[PDB]
Design a protein around this nucleic acid. Structure first.
Ligand SMILES: [Zn+2]
Lengths: 74, 121, 327, 53
RNA sequence: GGCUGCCUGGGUCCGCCUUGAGUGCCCGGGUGAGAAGCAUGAUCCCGGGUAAUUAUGGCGGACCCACA
RNA sequence: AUAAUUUGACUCAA
């Protein structure tokens, strides 16, 4: 697995915003530090060096993942 | 002061013009809204045109003054647009209003008509 | 604060003594009022409402032209600067389609964020970005990479942000604005927009609304005075300023107009900064656009040697009976 | 419409007064236009007097 | 060889490589008000409107082959 | 005719 960084906030539209440094692709698996499923990638945007990533949550509570570290399952 | 205004309006006369519409609303009939106003002019239906001094952009009403001298109609300017609407009886503003039926305001209208003659030529 | 179109080059001299003959050819000043329309571009102030495509057609009919174009698609709600190609100068759009752009944008935010954090994020959106054109687009839906030059913050009023912004061609404002809203959290949409710059086109006195456009046209058509309608349209050389130019001698004009490629022994003066593959504008000494084409050499190779092909002449605009044959 | 502009300095704002120089502010968006332009004849007559024709 | 006229590769300009009808939207004409946005047009009917360029293959035509 | 491009288009039929 590879690391992204710290979670910023959950948008009301349905996205968890993470601040990462590398370029991911469409429909990636997202897990936390203990290899448990969190969500799926839907939109990548922002600057070249440090892009933001918006996540579609396939879990019951995305309100407790505020101030967390999220990964990508490899 | 904007370029479509061809002559100065004494502050009392503008109030007199407002007094016309206010009363006209209840006793006669009126045309509220630039598009409507213009329609009221070309069909010769109008009797007095009342344009605001604070219209932006200039192009929306510009055509009225020359169209008024075309079909002989006397026309007048008034300070506010926000004030014109309230006197015409609406929430928002009107840029230009025209009166068809003077109602009781007959004499008040006919007097405004004569004081605009001298302010022209 | 500036664009790649802003960067001013410099005229270099391979030949100082090559002079121009005033009797052949017609400059922007001495073009007959009919000719100026054929080889003319309108610097238009587009009002909101219609699509840019519909704008073309009205001008087509009112002024009675059979071919017309534009420097990109601006949206119905959007307003501002639009270059308008006419008649022969219709194809000159290919130089303005990739050129740098600038808009003034208003952006509503759905929540509350203290003022100073916004500029910190507004600074951060300066560089390369990743975007996907929305469902409502004229190009293919693929993940390209567009360039952003600068975002200077105008003013703020709590939930609404006024800001000046200039970008590369094809870059989506709505896509960006939405993404900046997600960079702050609460999200964002665009309620209003206006263009301010497009290549070498900005809000000046040559800029004109559709009202004044048609007004001035009938003033020459019905009343017959040329001065007003003249400044309404611009010589097609205006849509060339942001491109590298090459000044060619009187003898090098006629040959090229017959489809010929420009050789080095035909060059008198040239702009600095030319590479192989770049489009270079071909100009007479009186500043008239002759043709467009790709360079075969650099600014050094055209300057030093005396033998070879310098510019592959691709698109001809200047007529043939302007300058007589001297090859 | 809300985007305004100064007819003197060239500054965009949201207020009524120029928050900079102090002039009256007007709407930036150009007048709405019709392919028919109904009363164009009359608008030209007003433009004649101002321009002096 | 130089030149004209028929001949034809390359370059360049102009044409052509579907037109109907429907959605969204826009604009005109007609009409003229209680979300509040909106008289700088709510609603309802009728009419009309929806551009260009590049690269390559095919086709009809117009010039010319030019290191100036 | 095919594929792209411009911040604005999508569905269908001989
Ligand atoms: Zn000011």
């Amino acid at each position: 697995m590879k690391r992204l960084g710290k979670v910023l906030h959950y948008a009301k539209q349905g996205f968890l915003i993470v601040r990462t440094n590398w370029v991911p692709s469409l429909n990636d698996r997202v897990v936390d530090k203990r290899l448990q499923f969190v969500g799926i990638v839907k939109d990548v945007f922002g600057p070249v060096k440090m892009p933001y990533v918006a996540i579609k949550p396939k879990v019951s509570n995305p309100e407790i993942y505020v101030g967390e570290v999220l990964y990508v399952d490899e | 002061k904007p370029s479509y205004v061809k002559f100065e309006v004494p502050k009392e006369l503008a109030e007199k013009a407002l007094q016309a519409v206010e009363i006209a609303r209840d006793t006669g009939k009126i045309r509220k809204g630039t598009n409507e106003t213009t329609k009221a002019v070309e069909r010769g239906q109008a009797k007095l045109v009342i344009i605001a001094e604070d219209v932006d952009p200039e192009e929306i009403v510009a055509h009225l003054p020359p169209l008024c001298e075309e079909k002989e109609i006397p026309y007048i300017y008034v300070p506010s647009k926000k004030e014109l609407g309230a006197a015409a009886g609406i929430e928002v503003a009107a840029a230009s209003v025209a009166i068809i039926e003077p109602g009781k305001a007959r004499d008040l209208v006919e007097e405004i008509a004569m004081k605009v003659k001298e302010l022209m030529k | 604060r500036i664009l790649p179109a802003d960067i001013k080059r410099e005229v270099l001299i391979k030949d100082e003594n090559a002079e121009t003959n005033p009797d052949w050819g017609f400059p922007p000043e001495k073009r007959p009022i009919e000719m100026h329309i054929q080889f003319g571009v309108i610097n238009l102030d587009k009002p909101p409402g219609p699509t840019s495509h519909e704008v073309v057609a009205w001008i087509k009919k009112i002024l009675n032209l059979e071919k017309a174009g534009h420097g990109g698609t601006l949206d119905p709600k959007v307003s501002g600067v639009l270059p308008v190609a006419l008649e022969k100068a219709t194809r000159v759009v290919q130089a303005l389609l990739p050129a740098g752009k600038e808009y003034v944008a208003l952006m509503h935010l759905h929540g509350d964020v203290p003022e100073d954090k916004i500029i910190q994020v507004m600074k951060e959106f300066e560089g390369e970005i990743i975007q996907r054109p929305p469902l409502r687009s004229a190009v293919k839906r693929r993940l390209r990479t567009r360039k952003v030059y600068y975002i200077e913050v105008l003013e703020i009023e709590g939930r609404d942000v006024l800001f000046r912004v200039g970008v590369e061609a094809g870059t989506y404002i709505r896509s960006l604005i939405h993404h900046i809203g997600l960079a702050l959290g609460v999200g964002a949409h665009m309620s209003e927009l206006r263009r301010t710059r497009s290549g070498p086109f900005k809000e000046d006195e040559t800029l004109i609304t559709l009202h004044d456009l048609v007004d001035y046209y009938y003033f020459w058509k019905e009343d017959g005075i040329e001065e007003y309608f003249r400044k309404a349209i611009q010589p097609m050389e205006k849509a060339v300023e942001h491109l590298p130019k090459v000044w060619i001698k009187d003898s090098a004009v006629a040959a090229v107009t017959h489809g010929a490629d420009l050789a080095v022994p035909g060059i008198a003066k040239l702009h600095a900064g030319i590479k192989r593959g770049d489009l270079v504008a071909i100009m007479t000494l009186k500043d008239e656009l002759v043709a467009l084409g790709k360079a075969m050499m650099t600014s050094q190779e055209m300057l030093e040697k005396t033998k070879g092909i310098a510019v592959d002449v691709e698109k001809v605009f200047m007529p043939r009976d302007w300058y007589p044959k001297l090859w | 419409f809300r985007i305004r502009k100064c007819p003197k300095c060239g500054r965009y704002t949201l207020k009524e007064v120029c928050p900079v120089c102090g002039e009256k502010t007007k709407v930036a968006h150009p007048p709405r236009f019709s392919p028919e332009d109904p009363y164009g004849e009359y608008r030209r007559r007003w433009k004649r007097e101002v321009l002096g024709i």
